Write a protein that binds this ligand. Structure first.
Ligand SMILES: O=C(O)[C@H](O)[C@@H](O)[C@H](O)[C@H](O)COP(=O)(O)O
Ligand SMILES: O=C(O)[C@H](O)[C@@H](O)[C@H](O)[C@H](O)COP(=O)(O)O
Lengths: 473, 473
């Protein structure tokens, strides 16, 4: 007993989190599957620090203060289970295993129940921020068995990012897989914001004819308005970036976007639980589309676009329209993501604090922006808020942006610039707005061909089947 | 041994299929879980027919000619397994169980492998057409263990719907769960076409100001053009339909659309296998949206739409634009659905005959239209066709529709009419068209914040990571 916590998994994420913990006065015992890396770390990044090294699992467990707290930061799937299996004969009742990898939420609840009745307290935490986020202040989203929380709270909230009011970007999310489900939705929303930015960029490049310097200048301005965020900031950096030959690097890199599952899982969860999370849907499919790079080369040779009509209009005004279209569409994505959280809370009986979740996304994480602060405000003044768009700030923001947004979609449509996320946000906005929607025709159709029955608009509850086929003869 | 086949499950679907088989000279032995329904059927719908009744499973198996063929048309899930479990001690090696319920494809391959090494030949067939489709000619999509097929071929292709060239709308789809996967995609595409029609309807009602009589008149005209289909036909019927009080029934029924999973499974499969099947995606979410009926009433009170600008333009011309927008968007949905089939064939090693599948959707099924015939042509002249849009017919059709389609989206956008499927089809069309897409910005972003690496456009294969953070200092 010397170390406050142990971390198994010495990739750069692990190492940075150990160093961050050590910088806050926590003695960490490091371990890795390939044990050589432990000495390597101790000689190099960890030289002259309070961290201990371990060369066996049994040794690492004896270095720990009781309750033994141990973090796992290994590749999600089987490895987590393999490590869990090995640690349980070695642990006392009341000891805490913490999985920080991007595990999917259903494995986390399985593991949590199983370990709970073996007396071992489990928590799956999402970590967001990447390498130097992890190093100097990550966003941490813990969930699992709450008996664990008071024991890890000091470490977790200490290494976590801080919001200018002194609050940590880390607090207890909920039971079982809540932290990991929230982490997944975080990534979903990240995909959406990235796709939105790409569409704004495409309108500037191809409608407006902007070179990457003016285009980066436009992004820098936007990062000083309501769009102030990490992602807007670094996009301006990326556009300005010149490679070794003097020319801009971005138009040289291949347009086939990768994915590591977390974004599609959000989309699949929304489909499974019947939540219209359309923009993340479109973002995920927009990446799949770009993967089909060879087909698109061949399609560009064959398929024809619109008549090339030059843009005649004040470019500065159009640049303003793209800014507001982007912000309006961002508002719908976030409303949809927060609808998904509301539904998972209902499905799995989690009591979630949405303003808590907003505060946890305010810093540390990739999606950080002033915008999350406005969402915490929305939930602070009404905790039971049903949808983000029903809050006056968002109501007024979308209402203000409406013109520009419709004008940017119609101009993009005219010029043939693909806007999967900008268009689906307006479709959802106009869909959500309408008290009466043409889905009654779908219900009439289903009853004509598969006798599925329908409700009358006055007294839902009764279900009718009409013999549509012939009303005489 | 007297009966050629047995059918367990006497709902109206089952009864109609038994009667259809009997009308084609096949002696059927009927059975049901609640055995009373068997006598009821034999006294009523089946009086004076060649069908036999059974009052036990053991009796039903002895009535059968070898190889014992038996169809199950029970509620999908556990019931299918329960019945499978009971039948196997009673069956000889080489006997055929056929599941005709809407089972999901992964259960079908499980059951097929398991039964295969117990010597029992399994096939999961999708049935499409509904009650009187089943009665006089359904669309049947069988897949499983091919040793079964020659034994059921005569029955299946005999009761099946016939295309004017004499061909049955039924042929072997492939191994394991191919028939059930195809059935699921069929339903996905059905959802899409229903949503597309709803959007056309919404533009007529709210932009153009058409009453349901002129609106039904417009649909009837469309059913005589390229849009000739079952769904366009019955929508015209539904719009004309007047209730007992003289007034039109459709505006009275509640706009909350139901779902029985088959449409969302298509969408989830596309997400899992990375196929941009966006329109079915949007159709499924557009139903989820309509379910949120109470929220939408409350949202309509709060959220504001566009400035009400009256439509000044030739309504007849705009009506033509909606027709072509619908047909163009239909083409993209079908291209996307056929991309999903192409990918599942690659994932599970099925050799699928896409023109075969088109011929099976040409009649019997809900989505039947002249249009499927054009798709069989596309695949007949080039079996290895990579995407439907690369075929000259579709190339020219979309190229012709382009103007009207862009004009209908921009006018819908102006007036605030939600078009989730019309917009996503144009987004996909313009996305697929472009050889260079802004997904390289997404790859640059992922490398800046999570060091995911990127490829250079010249020599894919090499993966670079740039220190974006500072190129000096
Ligand atoms: O996003 C974060 O904050 C996390 O550090 C982590 O989630 C990482 O970025 C993954 O790689 C997912 O992103 P992709 O699915 O695009 O790879
Ligand atoms: O569509 C058909 O041809 C089949 O007879 C069957 O699939 C039925 O219609 C289901 O109910 C699915 O439709 P929903 O998911 O909308 O209910």
């Amino acid at each position: 007993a010397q170390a406050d916590i142990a971390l198994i998994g010495l990739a750069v994420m692990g190492q940075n989190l150990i160093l961050n913990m050590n910088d806050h006065g926590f003695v960490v015992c490091a371990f890795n599957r390939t044990v050589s890396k432990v000495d390597d770390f101790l000689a190099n990044e960890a030289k002259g620090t309070k961290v201990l090294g371990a060369h066996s699992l049994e040794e690492m467990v004896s270095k720990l203060k009781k309750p033994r707290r141990i973090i796992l930061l290994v590749k999600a799937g089987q490895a987590v289970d393999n490590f869990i299996e090995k640690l349980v004969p070695l642990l006392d009742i009341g000891d805490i295993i913490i999985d920080g990898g991007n595990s999917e939420y259903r494995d986390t609840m399985r593991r949590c129940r199983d370990l709970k009745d073996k007396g071992i307290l489990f928590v799956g935490s999402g970590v967001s921020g990447g390498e130097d986020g992890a190093r100097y202040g990550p966003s941490l989203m813990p969930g699992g068995n709450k008996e664990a929380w008071p024991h890890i709270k000091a470490i977790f909230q200490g290494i976590a990012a801080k919001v200018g009011t002194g609050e940590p970007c880390c607090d207890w999310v909920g039971d079982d897989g809540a932290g990991h489900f929230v982490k997944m939705v975080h990534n979903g929303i990240e995909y959406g914001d990235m796709q939105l930015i790409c569409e704004a960029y495409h309108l500037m490049k191809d409608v407006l004819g902007l070179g990457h310097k003016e285009m980066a200048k436009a992004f820098e301005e936007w990062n000083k308005t309501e769009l102030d965020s990490f992602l807007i900031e670094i996009t301006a950096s990326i556009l300005k970036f010149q490679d070794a030959d003097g020319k801009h690097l971005l138009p040289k890199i291949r347009d086939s976007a990768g994915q590591k599952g977390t974004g599609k899982w959000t989309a699949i969860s929304a489909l499974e639980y019947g939540v219209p999370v359309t923009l993340i849907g479109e973002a995920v499919f927009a990446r799949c589309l770009s993967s089909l790079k060879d087909e698109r080369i061949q399609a560009s040779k064959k398929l024809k676009g619109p008549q090339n009509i030059p843009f005649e209009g004040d470019k500065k005004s159009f640049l303003e329209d793209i800014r507001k279209a982007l912000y309006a569409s961002k508002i719908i994505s976030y409303a949809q993501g927060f609808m998904l959280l509301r539904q998972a809370a209902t499905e799995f009986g989690w009591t979630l604090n949405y303003g808590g979740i907003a505060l946890m996304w305010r810093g540390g994480c990739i999606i950080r922006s002033v915008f999350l602060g406005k969402i915490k405000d929305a939930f602070d003044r009404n905790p039971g808020l049903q949808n983000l768009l029903l809050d006056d700030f968002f109501k007024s923001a979308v209402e203000n942006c409406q013109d520009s947004w419709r004008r940017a979609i119609s101009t993009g449509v005219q010029a043939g610039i693909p806007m999967p996320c900008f268009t689906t946000a307006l479709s959802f906005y106009d869909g959500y707005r309408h008290a009466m929607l043409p889905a009654n025709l779908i219900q009439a159709q289903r009853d004509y061909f598969g006798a599925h029955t329908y409700e009358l608009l006055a007294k839902p509850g009764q279900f009718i089947h009409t013999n549509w086929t012939g009303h005489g003869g």
